Design a protein around this ligand. Structure first.
Ligand SMILES: [Mg+2]
Lengths: 117, 234, 252, 57
RNA sequence: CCGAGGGGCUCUCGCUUCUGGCGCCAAGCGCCCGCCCGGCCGGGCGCGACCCGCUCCGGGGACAGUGCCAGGUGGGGAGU
RNA sequence: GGCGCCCUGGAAUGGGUUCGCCCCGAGAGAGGGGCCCGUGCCUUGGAAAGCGUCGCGGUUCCGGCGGCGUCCGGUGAGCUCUCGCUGGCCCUUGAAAAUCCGGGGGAGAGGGUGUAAAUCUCGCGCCGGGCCGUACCCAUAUCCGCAGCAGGUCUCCAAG
């Protein structure tokens, strides 16, 4: 053997794979924030109501740990509708407001009717 | 043949880049390496006392191979054969009740603390002693003691090798107490070859200091001053 | 009871040097097989300016002998070099201006700047602008030469101390007056925090051993012993004489 | 342009069809060509004038 | 040194200096397997790039340093 | 608008130019070209929208309906902003790095032809861009000074 460098750098040794022989928490914990806990209730003020028929957007109030990909599947799977885009906002009572715009295939003024308002 | 050409590289100063040469001297070692190397130097540079310097005078390998040939069939009992040896004692005692089935099972002892008991009782007939005990005071008394109780001793090279006799890692000493009487004539063969070299020489091996040689880069300039003194006279 | 200005400068809070816009530590290249046994060819690329130094610097590139690379050094610019000049460095380098070669090979009475005070040190003695050192009196056995420093103190050094031939560029720098207080502000803005030096007589007795009194006087003798404690070493420290000079130095 | 917009262009707007295209100034290319030529030849001249010096001394 | 074709009381080393260029990741030689029935491909090793050795190479070096004690000095500081 | 970019060619009776300078045999003047910036103008956007004005519908959603217009010039030591050219000053030389690019090299790679390969920084086309801030005051009344306190508190815009 020859040592072409004056540096002795330490050898790449073998690193095993952590394959333990008992689980440390025994069960995968469930997702507390699922598609019901995402989206608490819809917002029915005067400014949100005239954003329904004028803009094809319906407004909810969403749990503050939810990003827009989580919202976009949560309105799609609960209400069986396509979502164009989402715009969030933290309104200063502390809860996240989401402006869910629909795809133009759907309508907002009758999807609001089948959810109550 | 048509086009191929020699095109060598000038490797003097100011020409083509120097090749990957050896550099295994000029390489920055870890501090466990040069700590491990500088004391091999520093056993050679200090004045080593003769009590430590009993070692470095070990057996030549022809005698040491004859010695391990003799010690090979006196190998101690392993736990594999300890299972069946307590069977063969117990199955025949269950069948005949032997008053003495084996008068003499012979074996070699192991261990500093066991050997020291044998030498100062003069029960041992030859004391193999190791070379590279890391706290050398575990062994340094024992050559001086085998002279006084008159037991022959021999320093062997390597405490790993006689450790494999006893199925262990290091065992630092073994002893010969009862060899077979038919193979006493192999133990008695090399025992005068040994106590020529160790026990009879004790007046001189106790005087022999060790170490105290300068390094080769500093004893070479000693010789170059002496050649200049040799060129001064003639 | 209060500590004084001369004590606070070692703590290094607002008295640390202004080392931002400098171009680097200007040091000769580290020695190896080429400078012990031959010469290396290096071309000076540029002449630069450290803020806070009055010598200019010169950055030279050298073909790397071991890896295919070029690498750049910074020398104290010896006077009379120009960009695009080949600068030779090693033992067998030819004695020209700006080349750097060990003092055991250059003959006596040569003029040297930026010489190593011990072999390998990458250049320490006679570095500031306009200074030079003269070699004298080699000793070929017990290989060690003496030199003449810019203070006039002659000093025996090793014979293999590598050193660049010539005098430092930027000479004559202290001939022009600062001429006003504002250009002394700018002079020491780039160096340290040391410029407005209040007289110790002009302050209060907490703050200096001389200050106080109803007349601005020292009161006590201004020359102090060398084992004086920290905060009492003010004034003319460990003086061998005082007063306006007679002769040049007349004492080794 | 700015540095990161050079990722948007194509390499027709970023260099010139010479050797040392978008790096050198074309008049030191003109000198680097002559500087390499005139001094690789003199190290043939200084080689052969040295090579006839051992044979006729 | 003497001298005969030459030896070596003694030695020096050597392989880059008119120029703001280039320079690495082996050419070449020798070998050896699978490969062509004394021919063709696919790989490897050595020389090139000398051998041995106890500190990486230098500069210091039993002093400096440091530990404990002893004497100077000590409004730098403390207490009154 | 700028070029310290190119070619031809060679200048003293020296010449060319600046408000100042500066420039020339290491190539002036002159002639023909080249790149850079093009925040200016035309065009696509784009007249459909904007505004001005006149007129008529529609309780209500009405980003209603329609007519005509949205045009020519000049000037400047103007003021502000911006780009460039050129100097002056300094014992003062007036940040680092991520990122992105160009070059030098040529290990390699690719179909083997009257067929098409590797590759493509060219023209299209396809999918995605999460998280946090965003209101308002900015103070002779939303800040600090016990207060709707002649105090204090960093900036950008600016007419006759
Ligand atoms: Mg003063």
């Amino acid at each position: 053997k020859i040592r072409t460098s004056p540096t002795f750098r330490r050898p790449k040794t073998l690193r095993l794979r952590r394959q333990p022989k008992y689980p440390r928490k025994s069960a995968p914990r469930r997702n507390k924030l699922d598609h019901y806990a995402i989206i608490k209730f819809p917002l029915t003020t005067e400014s949100a109501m005239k954003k329904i028929e004028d803009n094809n957007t319906l407004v909810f109030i969403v749990d503050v740990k939810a990003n827009k990909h989580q919202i976009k599947q949560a309105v799609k799977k609960l209400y069986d509708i396509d979502v164009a885009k989402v715009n969030t906002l933290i309104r200063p009572d502390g809860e996240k407001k989401a402006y869910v715009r629909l795809a133009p295939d759907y309508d907002a003024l009758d999807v609001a009717n089948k959810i109550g308002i | 043949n048509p086009l191929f050409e020699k095109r060598p590289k000038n490797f003097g100063i100011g020409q083509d880049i120097q090749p990957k040469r050896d550099l295994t001297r000029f390489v920055k070692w870890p501090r466990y390496i040069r700590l491990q190397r500088q004391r091999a130097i520093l056993y050679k540079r200090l004045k080593v006392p003769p009590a430590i310097n009993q070692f470095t005078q070990a057996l030549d390998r022809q005698t040491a191979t004859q010695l391990l040939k003799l010690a090979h069939k006196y190998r101690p009992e392993t736990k594999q054969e300890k299972k069946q040896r307590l069977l063969a004692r117990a199955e025949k005692k269950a069948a005949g009740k032997g008053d003495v089935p084996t008068k003499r099972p012979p074996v070699l002892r192991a261990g500093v603390n066991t050997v020291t008991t044998l030498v100062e009782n003069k029960k041992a007939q030859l004391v193999v002693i190791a070379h590279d005990v890391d706290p050398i005071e575990l062994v340094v008394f024992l050559p001086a003691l085998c002279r006084k109780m008159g037991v022959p001793y021999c320093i062997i090279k390597g405490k790993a090798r006689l450790g494999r006799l006893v199925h262990r890692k290091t065992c630092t000493t073994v002893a010969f107490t009862q060899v077979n009487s038919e193979d006493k004539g192999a133990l008695a063969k090399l025992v005068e070859a040994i106590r020529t070299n160790y026990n009879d020489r004790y007046d001189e091996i106790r005087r022999h200091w060790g170490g105290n040689v300068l390094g080769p880069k500093s004893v070479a300039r000693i010789a170059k001053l002496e050649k200049a003194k040799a060129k001064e006279l003639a | 009871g209060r500590v004084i200005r001369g004590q606070r400068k070692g703590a290094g809070s607002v008295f640390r040097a202004h080392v931002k816009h400098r171009k680097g530590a200007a040091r000769l290249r580290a020695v190896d097989f080429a400078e012990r046994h031959g010469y290396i060819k290096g071309i000076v690329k540029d002449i630069i300016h450290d803020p806070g130094r009055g010598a200019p610097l010169a950055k030279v590139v050298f073909r790397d002998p071991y890896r295919f690379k070029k690498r750049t050094e910074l020398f104290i610019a010896a006077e009379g070099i120009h960009t695009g000049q080949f600068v030779y460095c090693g033992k067998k380098a030819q004695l020209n201006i700006g080349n750097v070669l060990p003092v055991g090979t250059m003959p006596e009475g040569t003029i040297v700047c930026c010489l190593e005070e011990k072999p390998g040190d990458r250049g320490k003695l006679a570095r500031a602008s306009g200074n030079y050192a003269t070699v004298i009196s080699h000793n070929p056995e017990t290989k060690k030469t003496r030199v003449k420093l810019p203070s006039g103190s002659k000093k025996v050094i090793s014979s293999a101390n590598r050193a660049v031939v010539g005098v430092v560029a930027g000479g004559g720098r202290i001939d022009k007056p600062i001429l006003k207080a504002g250009r002394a502000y700018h002079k020491y803005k780039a160096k340290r925090n040391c410029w407005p030096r209040v007289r110790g007589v002009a302050m209060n007795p907490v703050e200096h051993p001389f200050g106080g009194g109803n007349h601005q006087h020292i009161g006590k003798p201004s020359t102090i012993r060398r084992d004086a404690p920290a905060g009492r070493k003010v004034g003319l420290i460990a003086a061998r004489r005082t007063g306006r000079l007679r002769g040049t130095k007349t004492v080794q | 342009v700015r540095p990161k917009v050079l990722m948007r262009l194509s390499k027709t707007k970023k260099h010139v069809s010479r050797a040392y295209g978008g790096s050198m100034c074309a008049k030191c290319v003109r000198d680097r060509i002559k500087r390499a030529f005139l001094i690789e030849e003199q190290k043939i001249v200084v080689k052969v004038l040295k090579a006839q010096a051992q044979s006729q001394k």
